[PDB]
Amino acid sequence: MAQAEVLNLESGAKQVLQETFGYQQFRPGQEEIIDTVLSGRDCLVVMPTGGGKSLCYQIPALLLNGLTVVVSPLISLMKDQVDQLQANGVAAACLNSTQTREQQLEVMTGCRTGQIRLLYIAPERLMLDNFLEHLAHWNPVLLAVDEAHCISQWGHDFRPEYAALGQLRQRFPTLPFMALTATADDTTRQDIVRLLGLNDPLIQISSFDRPNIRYMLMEKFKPLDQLMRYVQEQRGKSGIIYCNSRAKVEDTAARLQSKGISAAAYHAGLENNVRADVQEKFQRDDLQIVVATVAFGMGINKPNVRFVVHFDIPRNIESYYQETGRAGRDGLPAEAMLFYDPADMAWLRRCLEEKPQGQLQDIERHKLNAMGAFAEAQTCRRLVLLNYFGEGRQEPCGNCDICLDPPKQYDGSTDAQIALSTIGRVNQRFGMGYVVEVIRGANNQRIRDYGHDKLKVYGMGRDKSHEHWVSVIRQLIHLGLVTQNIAQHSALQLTEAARPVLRGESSLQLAVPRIV
């Protein structure tokens, strides 16, 4: 079998980091994870980038005797990891249904004979053709599940092939598991641990704050002209412009090229050699801009992308966070610019509400609502993101469009106490609409049947508009005082941070709600 490379495991982690991978020091959370994995304890890793993430299982794999198995759905990216690893002297291979059976059998023979240390496998392949019975004889020492949020229906990218990964724990009870992801909120993180059967795992959630990325929004008004001007104002800085159609990509690349800008189109309709060339030309800074569909995702992630534009709003914050997160991997100042029109959200809502009714549509609706609320926020954009992912923070960043031009404020302490009290009084079971009706004292049969018309809070906000109360509550959500529980039909629920305001111990400044 693949042999451990270092005598002392504790000192080995840093030795391999530096000597094999060339990194001088660990990033936050990495050492902890790696030492925990080397101790044989299950782990869930929520990390800012794939880069720090992958070393969380590659370093352990080099310090252990045995085979490390890495499950990933990214076939054309898994194959790239292998080449890069092999170039660093690491015995890596991959197995998936796209390979010929001849090639698959060679990889299986490499694992059987102990010539392969690290095997990347597609989830479908791992659970097919009695592969697990073969895997049991190959001295498995660690099983890592990448893109682990894909096992959850509460996430933004559920994959049916991940569901069967819940059978691994039972089949390999003494095999330590790790689950890894860059984008999972609280509900999704909890679901990952439950579905994979992680045994009291170390849960390492790194910060979602990328302090060097400035987040901005521009309301659309002749948006093709706004986009060209934005690009002109970058004055040569590199960028990715994300569009939701191939024609937008192609037309946008042509208009930029017409103005002397070094830009290329990138989408799944290009040939593989053309895709690789565009990626390489962008990596080396031969190209200033790549205009792309969501296909030009992570994977290339040049460290020095200066800006990411979203011409069209994404369907969920998870996607928006992942895509904007491709900017400024080097830590130098970077910007994310989203062009928005409320008619864009109206269209997405239309598309969604005629899809099949039920649980799946509810999940999509919840995440779409939150994306629209981010766009229409009156609170620091960074706080919206951080609190969406459950990273409690109330201090404004000073580095987003809202922080650069804060809305007029008012003392919202009384309004916040009314909203927070209402949420508590209705036992945190109801969504935004119902709560606002209770506050405004509406004539509603449902309210009377629950007896909520007898509450003291009932009608305490009747003198302020529906949109006023929606804004108050949305700002409380964006500040992390209130959450929307996706597993309870988006019920409004209270956090620990709500306590001082609810008690009247602290004052709360809020944005005066926009008239709209």
Query: In sequence order, which residues have a C-beta less than 8 Å from that of residue 271 and are 6 or more positions away?
Result: none
Question: Is residue 216 involved in binding Zn ion (CB under 5 A)?
Answer: no
Q: Which two tokens stand for residue 262?
A: 């070094």
* Residue 451 annotated in ligand binding: no
Is residue 19 exposed (0-12), middle (13-18) or buried (19+ Cβ within 10 Å)? exposed
Q: Which two tokens stand for residue 127?
A: 């659970």
Nearer to Zn ion, 400 or 477 (CB): 400
CA distance 206 to 232: 35
Q: How much of the chain is helix, strand and coil, in % rounded to 5?
A: 45, 15, 40
Shortest CB 60 distance to Mn ion, Å: 12
Contacting residue, 82, 143, 144, 380, with Zn ion by CB under 5 A: 380
Which of 239, 265, 235, 236 shows the shortest CA–CA distance to 252?
265
Question: Is residue 453 involved in binding Mn ion (CB under 5 A)?
Answer: no
> What angle is formed at CA 382 by the lines to CA 265 and CA 159, rounded to 5 degrees?
55
Question: Is residue 9 involved in binding Zn ion (CB under 5 A)?
Answer: no
Phi-psi label, residue 451: left if phi above 0, alpha if psi -120 to 50, beta otherwise:
left
* Residue 51 annotated in ligand binding: yes
List the single partner that 397 binds among Mn ion, Zn ion, none, CB under 5 to 8 Å by kind: Zn ion
Nearer to Zn ion, 188 or 379 (CB): 379
Question: Is residue 35 involved in binding Mn ion (CB under 5 A)?
Answer: yes
Of 2-10, 123-131, 151-159, 248-256: span binding Mn ion (CB under 5 A): 2-10
CA distance between the termini of the chain: 66
Of 30-38, 87-95, 111-119, 160-168: span binding Mn ion (CB under 5 A): 30-38
List the single partner that 35 binds among Mn ion, Zn ion, none, CB under 5 to 8 Å by kind: Mn ion
Question: Is residue 497 involved in binding Zn ion (CB under 5 A)?
Answer: no
Shortest CB 480 distance to Zn ion, Å: 14
* Residue 97 annotated in ligand binding: no
Which of 210, 207, 231 shows the shortest CA–CA distance to 333?
210
Neighbour tally for 16: CB within 10 Å: 22
Question: Is residue 382 involved in binding Zn ion (CB under 5 A)?
Answer: yes
Of 146-154, 234-242, 249-257, 395-403: span binding Zn ion (CB under 5 A): 395-403
List the single partner that 186 binds among Mn ion, Zn ion, none, CB under 5 to 8 Å by kind: none
Site for Zn ion in 402-431 (CB under 5 A): 403
Shortest CB 379 distance to Zn ion, Å: 8
Neighbour tally for 132: CB within 10 Å: 15
String of b and e for 182-202 (b: at least 16 CB within 10 Å)? bbbbbbbbbbbbebbbbeebb
Q: Which two tokens stand for residue 495?
A: 């956090």
Shortest CB 21 distance to Mn ion, Å: 16
Cβ(420)–Cβ(476) under 8 Å? yes
Cβ(376)–Cβ(359) under 8 Å? no
List the single partner that 400 binds among Zn ion, Mn ion, none, CB under 5 to 8 Å by kind: Zn ion
* Residue 56 annotated in ligand binding: no
* Residue 150 annotated in ligand binding: no
Query: In sequence order, which residues have a C-beta less than 8 Å from that of residue 328 and are 6 or more positions away?
Result: 210, 212, 213, 304, 305, 306, 334
Nearer to Mn ion, 10 or 353 (CB): 10
* Residue 262 annotated in ligand binding: no
* Residue 197 annotated in ligand binding: no
Shortest CB 31 distance to Mn ion, Å: 5
H/E stretch holding 217 reads strand 213-219
Applying CB under 5 A, the residues found at the interface with Zn ion are 380, 382, 397, 400, 403
Q: Residues marked as binding? A: 10, 23, 27, 30-31, 35, 50-54, 380, 397, 400, 403
Q: Residues marked as binding for ATP? A: 23, 27, 30, 50-54
Applying CB under 5 A, the residues found at the interface with Mn ion are 10, 35
Q: Residues marked as binding for Mn(2+)? A: 10, 31, 35
Q: Residues marked as binding for Zn(2+)? A: 380, 397, 400, 403
